[PDB]
Structures are given as structure tokens and as C-alpha cells.
């Protein structure tokens, strides 16, 4: 109270100096350092350079030369000095860059646009690259609140830039409004006053991306609940008073250090007691949360203000039993930092367990109710185990989508089409084609989100899918009407014909069914689903029914068709590392409602929600939603029983955090396994992220790129001419070259030990000869400047040659093989290109349909893409290619490669898919006909697993491993053989194998009941165990074993 008042400079709020007349801009400079008067600094030395270039061209007279100082003020005020500069018209822009002399005042070339500010009267600011309608806009933003880049991080700390070796730094603070300068031009509200200090160890351990950060400290008694109760900022300023900047403070930091502790030890969600229901949120900041209950029919029938325990931050009331099956939201009162107010909006919960339909309400549900099991539910076992290194190791892993599975099935009931309840059709295509996949070995289905998504309009009247008249999609899609296609409306046929006509004309010029189909993706029921709405209720518009809790048995039937009709578990694609959105008012903006800026994460400086993933960025490192996560998990895994998890963008989590969930999950089922892809996230400054390498030895599973690149050619960045160029193994490089490409052997041999490596279970220290017949670790077999081997057991590693992500498998060989490979070669490349994955030691992973040589017409990211370019055809007809030119805003750039390539030959019929999915199971019978293909553990792989045909001198494209089971391996694992070879001839010449002649080796039993039909047709053994290998060919050949363990095929230490 003896206190120097901060303020505002005690000038007003300028006016406008001059107004442009016609043909004429004006810029205002708006000199707040002099406005801070003292001293009346001269603006002779202040000038513009000014320029003309085809983007803004309305300057009248430039001034080309760059030391040309002369264009000086027009004149000046004590606010500071403006420009009165001709035109040539009032319609365009002004390049201008800020000078005293020939320095730059802001670095930024600034453009002043005619649309924005139609008077061409503007304003800038020395230091700041913006431009503002009037220099009271200008000065109003220099002693305004800006950004975010104020953290307070703990009880007693604040690190904020701003602040640094100011004499005055204060955390102000204001309940109900926010701060601002007042009547007096002071600021008025309560503060805290900051004394300089340095990060404790503690801090910088906790934010080692804000440890150089300028420290403060706030006073040991601070009463920090009441200060989060509303608006908190930071501000500093001189001596005298004179605000130098305030900014708005980021506040998780200190949130996690209050209330962690003691919400952590809390469940959430609405919960059946015995007692009743007890409800509980997590919300530290908000002033008020009023439970509001909800009839059936949406009307409210009771509200209730919660219970704040002081503690924790969380908010609970209790109610009667009666309240299960009733709707319900969360009435906030709370200050939300973006839009600066204490906003009062209704939240459904984000521990949600049940919704209505399109999740507008949050459902109270006992997810233990017998009503909610299908019969049995409560018996139901895995199928396949995972218990051992090798059991994990056994998993070869089906990833589908609920659309992509029934949608265009006539076999399955029209009802249960794009529905959870289409894996109960026992006697449709689709379900018959999944039991006989997984009677040949595939174990694991593996679901595109089936959480709640945010994309997909669930209110079925709103919705308008291919199946249906033209006229339906004109209904509810207002954009039809005004199109090239709105003829159709009236034309009385479905969408589905509509396309087919239009693929008669459809050409890169003419590219019409992707044009048509854009405007069907808008208003469908089509989308992979990434985008999260609430993470712990199933899907609803997958359900017949999707107003309460239909969804959840009918979710459940579903998981018991899978792992009891069909007999393969269950794995979910997981995606907490974003959300659909955030902010106060967005509709699927749920967590940031709630606690604001603690779920997402920000950027340091300007306090906005970064959006690296896509979309909202979440912050799994921040307690609360890492307890949100991993309980979530645990209700997946409990009440669902779901097997397994796939973490979408796993390495923008915590190593730490995704190693927490794991250990808190095997405390409820040890066998659960957790995996996930990674490939770009830069947090690396804010913790240790969960990637591929910092992974190795802890048996979270990572999807592997390296053999995949290897094997399908290129990567994904990929376009143009690239696409063809880039061949990998699969596709010939090297040895079956296409007119464009120039692969030398020397990349080809590289290729091959990526792929070499991979099927070894892509390890960090196993040994193998590379491409120039030099001894190298996994570890350091180049992957584009990287490792390559990374792992420490093969379960650590995910092998894939296709996924729902980037082109199918088919299109890539489409756009890569030569000419002269025939359709036949190319069924057998896409085979002998999967045999790499199949026969490999790492996890195998494979998209849905590749047995049926899936095609998506080209389309590189299908997400949208709706029914049409995702379609799997389980009548077996075709294979989905050539249905059109793909999205032009995705593929557009590769229209003239796809026209180039696109009828070399002809499209796949039932001939060829019954032949893949032959080579398919008998490849899937092959990986678990024997334990040697599997032997989970990374030190047991480099005991027993070797390769031939190695070197500089190697025979390019013909992969041979051998697995050992004889005496220098210890155990015989399997009673019959004393070693295997798995021979992949990926060439277009027959090869002969001397590497064991003498040896007794004979051809796989599977492989010879196959006959013509196998992969190995034509395959000879000769009487001196010689062996032959056609071209194009994969062989599995064994070492019978005797009375006792042989020498089998040892392992050479190099
Ligand atoms: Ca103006
Ligand atoms: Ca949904
Ligand atoms: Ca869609
Ligand atoms: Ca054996
Ligand atoms: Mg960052």
C-alpha cells in the first residue's frame, strides 16, 4: 500500500493524425517509446522504402533504390510521425518496409492490404510486424494484455520472459472481469508482487523447455486457490509505474502441483454405488458446476450445485439409484483464458461411459449390467495368448474399418451394413472370408476408431450415404443443389449408379466421380474416425440404434463374434494425442471446456493450442490427463475386453507416461499389449518422447517403416514420377527395372538388408552381412541418416507392407512395376511381397483386403474417401481398381503418373483374388506352422537366425534366412525340424541354392499340399539337396530331424 501504482503512460488514446484522400494511403508510426515522453525524439531519420511486385502494385511512385532515405514523415504529432503516399487505385496492396535509415524498425516486410482497411489509413509500431486500423488500435494493443508466454509452474513460481530485470513484476489477478488499465488509466486489481529468484532442479525437471526461461517468486501464503478462481496476469513495469508489458499466464504447471496429488487418488465419471450415484469432474478453476439432470426427452429435471473438495479441485454430488439410464451434463461456470470470460456452458462428461445419439448428453450407465452382456459376455476368453515373448510374436494382425468390412456386402443384412453387429452374420461373404483368414493363421483383428468419434453425424435423418437415392443426397446436402451434378436430383437412381456412369468419361481431365464424391464425403457416414469426441463410449452411428446404450451391447456382440465365432482378438486403435477441438465454444470441444489450456497443449509464447498432430494437440504429460488416459484404457480393457491398443502418434506421449498406462493396465490383465506409430513429433525439448528408439526394451510395440519402405519402394512423400521411379523389393528394384527408374544395384542391395534386417525382427544388434560384404549391427544399417535396427526383441517391432494410411500395397506396385510384368507377376509381387512381413520374426501387420489385392483407385488418403474408394468387394469380383481418378486436392499432382500407368494391364478379377488369398493363407500358415518363425525374444533370434546369399556378389532380390533349431542353438524348440529356410525369390530369373547341398532339406509339407496353387510351384530339391526357385517365388524348406537333435543350420559368429 506504499506501493508505485503500474499504469498506463498519462497521455490519451490517440487519435488519427490524417485521413488518406482518394488515390492516396496513409501509415501512422506510432512512437510509444516517445509517448513514455522525456525526451521529443526526432523523425527525420525515420523513413519508408516502398515497392511494386506483382502481388501489391498500387504505389504511384517507388522508390527502387534501397540507400534512398528521402521518402521522410509527411508530418507529425507527439504520438509520432505518419506517410501520405499515392496510388494508382483504391483496389490492391503496398509493400512497405520501416526504416531509420537504412535499419530496419520492423524486420518483417509489412503489406498493407486495400480489402482489410477499405479507409487505407493504418498504423504499425516499431518492434511488431502488425498492422492496425487506427493508432488507438495500435497503442491500446503496445500497454495491453498480449500473449501467453507468463507459466506459472508451481505454488511459488512464475517464469515469464517479460518480467526480466524489470524492476516491477506483479501477478494480477481479477475474479469476476478482466484486468485492465481503469478510469485513472491504472490498474487497480489485486496483485501478488514477484521477486526475482532461479528455476529449482525440480522445475527444470519438469520443464526442461522453459528452464532458460527468467524466474520469479511469489510470496509462500499466496492463497493460489482463489487466484485460479478467475483472470491471472502477469505484468511489468519501470520505476515510475510505466507498464512495459502484461501478458496472460499459462497455468498447468501450477495446477498439476495443487491438486494433482490429491484428484489423482479420485475416480470420475457418473459411478453406481451401492449408495446410489456419485458424480465427480475434475475442474480446479471454476467458480461453479451445477449437475443438471435430463428426461429422456432432453428436458431438464434437476439441477444441482456440486461439492468442491479444496483438496483436489474435483466437484461430486450423490444422488439415488434411480439416476442410471439418465441423461446429464455439467453446468460450468469457469474463466476460459482464450476468450478472456467466465463462461457458463452445459458439458457432456469426458469420463462418459454412455451418450445419446451424437453425444450431445452424457448417460448415466452401470457398464456391469448383465442387460448391457451378450449372453456369455462374462466367460468370454482370448483366443490367442500373450503371455510369453513368443505368443506376442505369434500376432499377424487384420486392420479393418467397420465400413470398409460390411458396407457393400448384399450378403449381410441391409440393417447390420457399416455396423459393430455385421461380424454376427455368420453366413455372409465377409464374415465367411474373416473365419477362413483366421482358420489359416491371421489372429488378430485390429479396429479403425470405434470410440466416439466427432465427424460422422449420428442423427441417421442427416445423413445421406451412396446406397440411397440422388434425391436423399440433394435433401441434406445443401452444396448438391448448386453443383455440376444437380441434375441428378430428380433423376431417380442411387448415388452408387451415379458414380458408376460416371467413371465412363472419368479421366485426368475430366476427373468426375472425385468431384461428385467430395461433395458425398461431406454429408456420409464415411471417415476413419480419428477425430476424438468422448474416448470411453463406442461409436454411435455404428450401432443401429445410437440414443443411449444399444451401442454398448451391440459393441459387445460384436467383440464376441470376433474372438468366439471368428476366433481372433481384438486390438483398438487409440487417439489421445489430440482432440476434435478446443476453445470455449466449439461443440466437440469438451476437456477444454471444463479445466481450459490444462488438456491441450499450448505454444509457450502465444498460449494457443498447437495443432502438430492436425487438429487440438493434447498434453498427456500433464497428470490429469494421463490419469484420464490410463483410465480410460482400463474401461476398454475391463468392460470391453480389448486385448490390445494401438496408440495413434505415439511419440508425441511421454515414454514415461505411455510406460505409466502400461504398468497400470497390467495390474488388470498382464497379457494386454500396447503399440503404436511415430514419425514426426518434436517435443523431444519438453520430455522424452515415446519413439521407436527411446522404446527399445520396453516391450511397447513400434510400427517399423524400414522394411515397408524397403519392400513397397520409396516413401511417403513420394509424387509425381517418384511414385514410379522409387521401386522397392516387391516391385523389382534392381532386377526388373521399369522406363523411368535409375536404382543402381548398389540401392538395391541396400533395400535388401533394410528387408534382411526387418524380417530378423529389426534389431539393434543383430549382426548381418551388408550390402558391400561388410559385418554390421542392426543399429547401424542406414534408415535415412538413421538406425535403422532398433529394437530389442522382434515383439518390440510392427512389420507392415500396407495400412490404412498412405497407398495400398496393389496401387504401389501398380505404379512401379514394368511394363512387361504381366497380371499374374503381379499378383505374384504383391504376394512375395507380403511374404517378407508374414514370414518374418517381427509382429505381422497387414491392411484389410490385401489378400484380395485391395486398391483404392490410386488414393493416397483415403480418410474420406467414403464408400466408394474404400470399397472391399467380398463377392470377389474386383479389386476396387480403376473405379476413377482420386481426390484431386490429395492426388492431383499424380494425375499424370496414374494416366501413364494406370492400363498397363488388366484389372483383377476373381481369378486372381481366390489365387492371392490362396498364397495369403498359405503364407499365414506358414508363420505359425512352426515356433521357429516366432521366437519372441531378441537374443534367442540372434542365436538361431542367419541369412545366405549375402555380400556384394549377392544374387539381387533373393532373400534366404535361415532358422536354427540343431545343437548350437540349445533347445530343440520344434520336435520335427532341426532348422527351416525361408527363400524369397523377388526376381524375374530362376536361381539355384548350392548354400545346402547334402543337407536333406526338403520342401515344406503346406507348401506341397498347395501344389500348382502354391507360392513355390515349380520348386525343385534335387537328390543332392540342390534347390531351384522360379522366378517370383517363395519358398519354406526344412531340415527333418531324427532320433535325436541334429546340426541343423548354425548360426556363423562374423
Ligand atoms: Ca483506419
Ligand atoms: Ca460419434
Ligand atoms: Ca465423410
Ligand atoms: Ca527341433
Ligand atoms: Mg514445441
Not at 524489470?166 to 472481469?177: A, C, D, N
Not at 466449439?586 to 499450448?602: A, E, F, G, H, N
Not at 506421449?653 to 497379457?671: F, T, V
Amino acid at each position: 500500500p506504499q506501493d508505485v501504482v503500474v499504469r498506463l503512460p498519462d497521455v490519451a488514446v490517440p487519435g488519427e493524425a490524417v485521413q488518406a484522400s482518394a488515390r492516396q494511403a496513409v501509415i501512422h508510426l506510432v512512437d510509444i517509446a516517445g509517448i513514455t515522453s522525456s525526451t521529443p525524439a526526432d523523425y527525420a531519420t525515420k523513413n519508408l522504402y516502398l515497392w511494386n511486385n506483382e502481388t501489391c502494385d498500387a504505389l504511384s511512385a517507388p522508390v527502387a533504390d534501397w540507400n534512398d532515405v528521402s521518402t521522410t514523415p509527411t508530418g507529425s504529432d507527439k504520438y509520432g510521425p505518419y506517410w501520405v503516399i499515392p496510388l494508382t487505385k483504391e483496389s490492391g496492396c503496398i509493400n512497405v518496409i520501416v526504416r531509420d535509415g537504412t535499419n530496419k524498425l520492423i524486420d518483417s516486410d509489412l503489406r498493407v492490404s486495400f480489402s482489410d482497411f477499405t479507409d487505407r489509413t493504418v498504423s504499425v509500431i516499431a518492434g511488431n510486424s502488425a498492422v492496425y486500423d487506427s493508432r488507438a488500435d495500435a497503442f491500446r494493443a503496445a500497454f495491453g494484455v498480449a500473449l501467453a508466454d507468463a507459466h506459472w509452474v508451481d505454488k511459488t513460481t512464475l517464469l515469464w520472459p517479460g518480467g526480466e530485470n524489470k524492476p516491477i513484476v506483479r501477478l494480477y489477478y481479477s475474479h469476476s472481469s478482466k484486468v485492465a488499465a481503469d478510469s485513472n488509466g491504472e490498474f487497480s486489481d489485486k496483485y501478488v508482487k514477484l521477486t526475482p529468484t532461479t528455476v529449482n532442479q525440480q522445475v527444470s525437471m519438469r520443464f526442461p523447455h522453459l528452464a532458460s526461461y527468467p524466474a520469479f517468486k511469489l510470496p509462500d501464503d499466496v492463497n493460489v486457490d482463489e487466484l485460479l478462481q478467475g483472470e491471472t496476469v502477469a505484468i511489468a513495469a519501470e520505476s515510475d509505474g510505466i507498464l512495459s508489458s502484461a501478458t496472460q499466464v499459462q497455468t498447468a504447471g501450477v495446477l498439476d502441483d495443487t491438486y494433482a496429488a490429491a484428484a489423482e487418488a479420485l475416480s470420475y465419471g457418473a459411478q453406481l454405488t451401492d449408495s446410489g450415484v456419485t458424480f465427480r469432474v475434475w475442474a480446479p478453476t471454476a467458480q461453479q458446476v451445477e449437475l443438471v439432470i435430463y428426461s429422456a426427452d432432453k428436458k431438464v429435471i434437476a439441477s444441482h450445485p456440486m461439492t468442491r473438495d479444496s483438496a483436489s479441485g474435483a466437484w461430486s454430488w450423490q444422488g439415488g439409484s434411480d439416476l442410471k439410464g439418465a441423461f446429464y451434463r455439467y453446468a460450468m461456470t469457469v474463466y476460459h483464458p482464450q476468450s478472456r470470460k467466465v463462461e457458463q456452458y452445459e458439458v457432456t462428461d469426458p469420463y462418459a461411459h454412455s451418450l445419446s445419439t451424437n453425444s450431445e448428453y452424457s448417460q448415466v450407465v452401470d457398464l456391469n449390467d448383465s442387460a448391457l452382456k451378450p449372453e456369455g459376455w462374462d466367460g468370454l476368453t482370448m483366443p490367442h495368448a500373450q503371455k510369453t515373448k513368443a505368443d506376442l510374436a505369434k500376432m499377424t494382425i487384420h486392420e479393418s474399418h467397420i465400413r470398409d468390412l460390411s458396407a457393400w456386402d448384399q450378403t449381410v443384412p441391409a440393417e447390420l451394413r457399416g455396423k459393430y453387429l455385421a461380424l454376427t452374420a455368420q453366413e455372409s461373404n465377409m464374415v465367411q472370408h474373416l473365419k477362413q483368414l483366421s482358420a489359416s493363421g491371421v489372429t488378430h483383428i485390429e479396429l479403425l476408431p470405434v470410440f466416439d468419434l466427432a465427424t460422422v453425424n449420428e442423427f441417421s435423418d442427416k445423413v445421406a450415404d451412396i446406397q440411397q437415392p440422388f434425391s436423399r443426397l440433394c435433401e441434406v446436402n445443401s452444396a448438391v443443389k448448386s453443383s455440376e451434378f444437380a441434375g441428378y436430383c430428380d433423376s431417380g437412381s442411387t448415388v452408387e449408379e451415379v458414380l458408376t456412369q460416371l467413371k465412363q468419361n472419368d479421366s485426368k481431365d475430366n476427373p468426375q466421380v472425385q468431384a461428385l464424391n467430395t461433395l458425398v464425403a461431406q454429408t456420409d457416414s464415411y471417415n476413419w474416425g480419428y477425430d476424438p469426441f468422448h474416448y470411453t463410449v463406442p461409436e454411435g452411428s455404428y450401432a443401429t440404434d445410437p440414443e443411449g446404450t444399444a451401442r454398448i451391447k451391440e459393441f459387445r456382440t460384436m467383440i464376441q463374434a470376433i474372438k468366439q465365432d471368428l476366433g481372433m482378438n481384438v486390438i483398438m486403435d487409440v487417439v489421445y494425442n489430440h482432440t476434435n477441438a478446443a476453445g470455449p465454444t466449439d461443440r466437440t470441444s469438451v476437456l477444454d471446456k471444463i479445466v481450459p489450456w490444462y488438456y491441450q497443449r499450448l505454444n509457450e509464447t502465444t498460449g494457443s493450442v498447437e495443432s502438430a498432430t492436425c487438429c487440438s494437440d493434447s498434453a498427456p504429460e500433464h497428470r490429469m490427463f494421463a490419469k484420464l488416459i490410463a483410465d480410460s484404457l482400463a474401461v476398454w480393457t475391463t468392460d470391453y475386453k480389448i486385448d490390445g491398443f494401438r496408440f495413434d502418434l505415439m511419440l508425441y506421449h511421454p515414454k514415461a507416461q505411455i510406460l505409466s498406462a502400461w504398468e497400470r493396465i497390467k495390474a488388470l490383465n498382464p497379457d494386454i499389449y500396447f503399440f503404436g506409430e511415430g514419425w514426426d513429433s518434436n517435443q523431444s525439448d519438453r520430455f522424452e518422447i515415446a519413439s521407436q528408439i527411446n522404446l527399445k526394451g520396453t516391450g511397447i510395440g513400434t510400427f517399423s517403416d524400414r522394411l515397408r519402405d524397403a519392400v513397397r519402394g520409396g516413401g511417403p512423400f513420394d509424387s509425381g514420377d517418384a511414385l514410379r521411379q522409387n521401386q522397392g523389393v516387391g516391385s523389382g528394384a534392381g532386377v526388373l527395372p521399369n522406363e523411368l527408374t535409375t536404382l543402381s544395384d548398389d540401392q538395391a542391395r541396400h533395400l535388401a538388408d533394410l528387408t534382411r534386417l526387418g524380417m530378423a525382427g529389426n534389431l539393434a544388434d543383430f549382426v548381418l552381412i551388408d550390402k558391400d560384404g561388410a559385418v554390421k549391427r542392426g543399429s547401424e544399417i542406414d534408415y535415412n541418416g538413421a538406425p535403422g535396427g532398433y529394437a530389442a526383441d522382434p515383439t518390440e517391432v510392427v512389420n507392415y507392407v500396407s495400412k490404412h494410411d498412405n497407398q495400398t500395397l496393389w496401387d504401389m506396385i501398380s505404379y512401379k512395376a514394368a511394363q512387361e510384368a504381366d497380371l499374374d507377376t503381379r499378383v505374384r509381387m504383391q504376394a512375395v511381397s507380403l511374404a517378407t512381413v508374414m514370414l518374418g520374426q517381427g509382429i505381422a501387420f497387414d491392411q484389410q483386403g490385401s489378400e484380395l489385392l485391395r486398391s483404392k483407385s490410386f488414393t493416397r488418403d483415403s480418410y474420406d474417401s467414403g464408400d466408394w474408394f474404400n470399397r472391399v468387394d467380398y463377392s470377389l469380383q474386383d479389386n476396387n481398381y480403376n473405379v476413377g481418378m482420386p481426390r484431386s486436392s490429395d492426388d492431383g499432382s499424380n494425375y499424370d503418373i496414374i494416366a501413364r500407368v494406370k492400363d498397363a494391364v488388366a484389372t483383377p478379377g476373381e481369378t486372381e483374388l481366390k489365387q492371392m488369398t490362396a498364397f495369403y493363407q498359405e503364407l499365414t500358415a506358414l508363420r505359425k506352422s512352426s515356433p521357429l518363425f516366432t521366437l519372441g525374444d531378441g537374443a534367442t533370434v540372434m542365436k538361431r537366425v542367419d541369412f545366405r546369399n549375402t555380400g556384394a556378389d549377392q544374387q539381387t532380390g533373393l532373400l534366404v534366412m535361415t532358422i536354427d533349431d540343431g545343437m548350437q542353438a540349445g533347445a530343440s524348440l520344434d520336435s520335427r525340424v532341426d532348422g527351416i529356410v525361408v527363400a524369397i525369390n523377388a526376381a524375374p530369373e530362376s536361381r539355384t541354392l548350392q548354400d545346402f547341398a547334402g543337407t536333406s532339406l526338403q520342401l515344406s509339407a503346406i507348401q506341397q499340399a498347395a501344389g500348382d496353387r502354391s507360392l513355390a510351384s515349380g520348386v525343385q530339391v534335387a537328390a543332392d539337396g540342390s534347390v531351384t526357385l522360379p522366378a517370383w517365388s517363395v519358398a519354406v524348406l526344412e531340415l527333418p530331424q531324427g532320433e535325436s537333435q541334429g546340426a541343423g543350420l548354425p548360426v556363423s559368429s562374423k
